Amino acid sequence: MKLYYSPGACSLSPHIALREAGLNFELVQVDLASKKTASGQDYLEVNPAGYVPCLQLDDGRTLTEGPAIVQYVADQVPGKQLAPANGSFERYHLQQWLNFISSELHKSFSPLFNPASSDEWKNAVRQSLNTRLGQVARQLEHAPYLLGDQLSVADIYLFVVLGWSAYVNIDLSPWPSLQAFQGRVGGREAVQSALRAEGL
Amino acid sequence: MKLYYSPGACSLSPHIALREAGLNFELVQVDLASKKTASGQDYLEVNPAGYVPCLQLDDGRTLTEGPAIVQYVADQVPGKQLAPANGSFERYHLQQWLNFISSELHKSFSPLFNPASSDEWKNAVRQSLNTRLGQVARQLEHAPYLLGDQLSVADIYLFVVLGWSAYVNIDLSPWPSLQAFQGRVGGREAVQSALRAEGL
Numbered sequence: 464m465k466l467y468y469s470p471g472a473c474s475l476s477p478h479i480a481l482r483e484a485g486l487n488f489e490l491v492q493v494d495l496a497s498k499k500t501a502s503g504q505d506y507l508e509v510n511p512a513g514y515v516p517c518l519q520l521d522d523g524r525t526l527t528e529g530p531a532i533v534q535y536v537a538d539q540v541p542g543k544q545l546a547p548a549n550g551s552f553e554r555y556h557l558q559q560w561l562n563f564i565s566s567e568l569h570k571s572f573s574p575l576f577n578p579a580s581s582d583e584w585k586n587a588v589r590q591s592l593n594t595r596l597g598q599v600a601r602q603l604e605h606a607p608y609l610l611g612d613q614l615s616v617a618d619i620y621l622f623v624v625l626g627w628s629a630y631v632n633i634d635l636s637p638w639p640s641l642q643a644f645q646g647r648v649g650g651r652e653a654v655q656s657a658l659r660a661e662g663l
Numbered sequence: 664m665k666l667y668y669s670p671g672a673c674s675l676s677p678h679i680a681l682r683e684a685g686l687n688f689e690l691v692q693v694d695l696a697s698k699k700t701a702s703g704q705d706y707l708e709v710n711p712a713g714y715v716p717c718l719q720l721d722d723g724r725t726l727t728e729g730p731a732i733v734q735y736v737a738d739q740v741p742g743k744q745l746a747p748a749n750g751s752f753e754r755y756h757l758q759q760w761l762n763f764i765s766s767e768l769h770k771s772f773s774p775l776f777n778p779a780s781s782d783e784w785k786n787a788v789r790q791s792l793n794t795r796l797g798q799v800a801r802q803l804e805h806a807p808y809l810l811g812d813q814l815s816v817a818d819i820y821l822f823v824v825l826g827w828s829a830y831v832n833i834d835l836s837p838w839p840s841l842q843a844f845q846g847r848v849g850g851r852e853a854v855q856s857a858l859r860a861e862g863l
């Protein structure tokens with residue numbers, strides 16, 4: 464099993480998930496520019512859209528999109544309880560949060576990283592983010608994790624996205640529950656092992 | 664079961680899925696400007712983020728995010744095969760496609776429907792879409808649907824987002840396989856019933 468990744472990128476979410484699952488896998492780094500792997504192979508042969516993550520199975524079969532990948536990972540080690548059982552209502556609730564993180568958080572961070580983007584663009588996105596962060600913050604007043612008392616792959620994804628705040632000049636202090644969350648997920652061994660393996 | 668919708672918005676996706684599934688439900692229109700439902704209820708009481716779709720279950724529980732909703736819907740009628748079975752590889756592959764449509768397609772249409780979006784934002788997004796729609800056109804070149812020969816809720820979601828192109832002046836002429844896909848899906852009785860039901 465292979466995870467195509469780039470240090471600090473959103474591929475850190477499946478990376479943390481794999482560790483939390485206690486699975487073994489190979490990291491393959493990708494040059495996000497020439498779209499070539501560390502071993503000099505063409506990545507657009509693996510993922511046509513040219514982004515990370517991509518999970519490749521022993522099979523040769525592949526999966527892209529974080530929310531899909533992290534669900535595949537969790538379902539390999541149900542004992543770890545990293546996602547609700549499929550067919551339970553809480554699994555749809557997991558998927559809801561995964562899509563929220565991806566479409567409402569992650570995609571809003573994207574143009575803040577972009578040097579080309581105007582200041583009128585960035586400021587509109589920053590206002591939307593503040594609002595969406597407020598919503599996530601309120602959720603994390605109810606319980607230490609997005610779905611309650613057990614860590615799920617949705618918390619892992621959220622931890623990764625929130626960790627980008629430092630690079631786009633977002634202070635998380637206005638939301639005590641988001642800082643409490645960061646701290647709580649930040650100090651897990653699997654998470655640390657993942658940051659270490661990525662040089663962070 | 665209630666579906667909160669706005670005519671022609673992304674909620675048309677669960678709408679079509681519900682009809683494909685043959686399920687009983689009540690459409691509840693939402694004024695996206697004033698954020699009031701048809702009954703005059705404050706819609707933020709229902710979805711804290713303020714957007715459609717939202718699925719309200721018989722028992723009062725709610726689900727947001729298109730990709731979560733359409734999976735719940737499909738899982739209600741497994742005989743109809745609107746999604747591959749949970750735990751199968753092809754179900755992760757559906758979630759990949761659903762997250763792709765949401766984060767890579769839908770979210771890039773969003774600024775185009777905005778008057779207050781700068782022409783810089785719009786030009787960038789149109790370019791992202793040109794590339795991303797190319798990837799989907801290639802996917803739909805030698806197979807009728809996203810997952811192969813079987814229509815799924817991913818195809819329904821794609822069909823709805825593609826339908827937005829006329830309203831924001833996106834020409835799909837460079838992608839004949841996408842127009843072919845539109846005619847393949849748009850010709851289904853549940854799709855045409857939903858269009859009619861939304862007053863379109």
Ligand SMILES: N[C@@H](CCC(=O)N[C@@H](CS)C(=O)NCC(=O)O)C(=O)O
Pocket residue numbers: 472473474495512513514515516527528529530565762763766767
């Ligand atoms: N929709 C994709 C987005 C993946 C994505 O935005 N990956 C970024 C890193 S966080 C990337 O590889 N860079 C963008 C690119 O070069 O295309 C997903 O959720 O997996």
Ligand SMILES: N[C@@H](CCC(=O)N[C@@H](CS)C(=O)NCC(=O)O)C(=O)O
Pocket residue numbers: 562563566567672673674695713714715716727728729730765
């Ligand atoms: N992340 C949400 C996005 C939903 C969404 O962007 N809905 C739009 C219509 S397509 C909407 O209700 N408009 C936003 C608003 O009215 O403020 C999802 O995938 O369901």
Ligand SMILES: O=C(O)/C(O)=C/C=C/C(=O)c1ccccc1
Pocket residue numbers: 469470471472473569570572573574576627630
């Ligand atoms: O969301 C995007 O468009 C995107 O490419 C995000 C990438 C983020 C990073 O690679 C990254 C690396 C180190 C630290 C923070 C962020």
Ligand SMILES: O=C(O)/C(O)=C/C=C/C(=O)c1ccccc1
Pocket residue numbers: 669670671672673769770772773774776826827830
């Ligand atoms: O993508 C969005 O965030 C968004 O607000 C999409 C809106 C879709 C529509 O309401 C719509 C309605 C009729 C025709 C085309 C589009």
